[PDB]
Amino acid sequence: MALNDEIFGIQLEAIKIIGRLSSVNPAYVVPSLRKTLLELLTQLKFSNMPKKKEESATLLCTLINSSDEVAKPYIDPILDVILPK
């Protein structure tokens, strides 16, 4: 629940902590990672304000760098939004 906080640096480091834990206890991490990935992908295209777009895009950057397990199978939905941007 620290993934949604006031300062953007808190989110930037908390998603990295989540990505690091994505190989320790993955049973309770990976589905939640899927949920927040879907939430961010929905907001990235249904939101209409540039700072929100910025935060979503670089949150996706730091998540995709910090966790490779939730990366590969979701390449098509994660590209269908970013590619026409």
Binding site: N4, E39, T42, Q43, F46, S47, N48
Partner: protein, 171 residues
């Protein structure tokens, strides 16, 4: 106006038995929507809300058409109060199949919130009374307005501040 108030009157007096003509009337009213000055658009949408409040579910094969009408006619010059009255009427008359199209009305709600808040913010007050009516509907889309209504409890005046916090509590 006479041609529309006649149909309004007969439907209102008769009830849920002339519903077989919905395949003709609403396609007959969208053409009237298409070419008309903003002088009577308020009256047209008010009478359409009156149709909705008496005919609930059989509008289902035309709800995409009514949101299409609102989408290609959603300016400031159109009565935003009448538009949100239409939205609350169709939501209340529909009550459950709303999932297919939450983001459209939700983005319209964002635009209404962030466009105008003048005259004691009566339209923001109405929209905060409209967002609470949606009920369990936000079980998967509760990440767009909830940060917004969290933000607008310290970045605005005090007339609608308590309205926003009551909206937060009720949601």
């Amino acid at each position: 106006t006479a041609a529309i108030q006649a149909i309004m009157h007969i439907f209102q007096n008769l009830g849920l038995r002339c519903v077989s003509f919905l395949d003709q009337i609403i396609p007959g009213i969208i053409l009237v929507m298409r070419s008309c000055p903003p002088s009577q658009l308020d009256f047209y949408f008010q009478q359409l809300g009156s149709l909705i409040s008496i005919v609930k579910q059989h509008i289902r094969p035309h709800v995409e058409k009514i949101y299409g009408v609102i989408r290609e006619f959603f300016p400031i010059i159109k009565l935003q109060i009448t538009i949100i009255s239409v939205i609350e009427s169709i939501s209340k008359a529909l009550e459950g199949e709303f999932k297919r199209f939450v983001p459209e009305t939700l983005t319209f709600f964002l635009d209404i919130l962030e466009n105008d808040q003048s005259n004691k913010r009566i339209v923001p007050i109405r929209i905060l009374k409209s967002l609470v009516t949606f009920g369990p509907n936000l079980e998967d889309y509760s990440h767009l307005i909830m940060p917004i209504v969290v933000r607008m409890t310290e970045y605005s005046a005090g007339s609608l501040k308590k309205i926003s916090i009551i909206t937060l509590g009720r949601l």
